[PDB]
Known about the structure:
This is part of a larger assembly, with chains A and B. Chain A contains three helices and no strands. Chain A has helices at about 10-15, 30-45, 55. The longest helix of chain A is centred in the middle third of the chain and has 15 residues, at about 30-45. Chain A is mainly α. Chain B is mainly alpha-helical. In chain B, about 65% of the residues lie in helices and about 0% in strands. Chain B has 13 helices and no strands. Chain B has helices spanning about 5-15, 20-35, 40-55, 60-70, 75-80, 85-90, 95-110, 115-125, 135-145, 150-165, 170-180, 185-195, 205-215. In chain B, helix 1 (about 5-15) packs antiparallel against helix 2 (about 20-35), helix 9 (about 135-145) runs parallel beside helix 11 and helix 11 (about 170-180) packs parallel to helix 13. The radius of gyration of chain B is 18 Å and the shape is globular. The chains are: A mainly alpha, B mainly alpha. Chain A: This is Mitochondrial F1F0 ATP synthase associated 14 kDa protein. Chain A: It comes from Polytomella sp. Pringsheim 198.80.
Amino acid sequence: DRVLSLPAVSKNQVLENVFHTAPKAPVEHLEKMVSANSKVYDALNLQSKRVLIWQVKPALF
Amino acid sequence: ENDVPAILKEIDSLVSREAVSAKEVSDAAVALTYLQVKANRRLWGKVLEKAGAAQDYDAASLTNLLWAINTGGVEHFKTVAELAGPAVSLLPSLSPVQLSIVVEALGGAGVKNYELYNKASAVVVSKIGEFKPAEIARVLYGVAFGGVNDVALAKAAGKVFASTEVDSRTAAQALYALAKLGRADKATVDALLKSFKKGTESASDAAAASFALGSLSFKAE
């Protein structure tokens, strides 16, 4: 019964209690806000090819 | 150095920026009538686009704008009829010489604002001596063409046109206002009809007195 003197908690159960959650990448905040601010650029810039300024305030000609 | 199309591009870049105020959009409109810019419609469109966006409006910039809209012959009902919001809030703040330009421009465009012309006729009969004869005709042109059949003003204007004889252009505006009201008062049409052989300078007021006489069916002059 030498196995009953070994630590009963497995090496697996250490690696799933220490590494419980997949950690958040540093770059996943950049490349997720950048793709969402690229829609703020598109709609709201005045130099974009798809501005909403002629759709929401139609021009007086 | 006398640059008229190069000053249109300098006016175009004044009203194409982001935070044009009332005074900068008044004077852009005033400069487009003195320059007689009927050919460029988009430049007149950029001015009335900023004229709806402009939020503060003192007494002098509202009447300079409304003069320029009326004199320039530019009409956009949405822009001009929402300029009656500044006017009913600046109405005790307005000069008697300035209230004639507001009500003539808002009336001549057809702005259906009964709160404006009720308060702007009650002012012009509370101070009837304070208004020169050209100003009582401009208010009368406005209240008539704004859809108000105010005969209280048309009597008080008729007592002024009998006491003092008026200019030719002053009378023909007053005839045109009484023609739309459909009044045909012999006491006041003939008091305004004597102003038309001292020499008239425009043909627009000879043609409008022509229209106003025939619509009331008086006879030619």
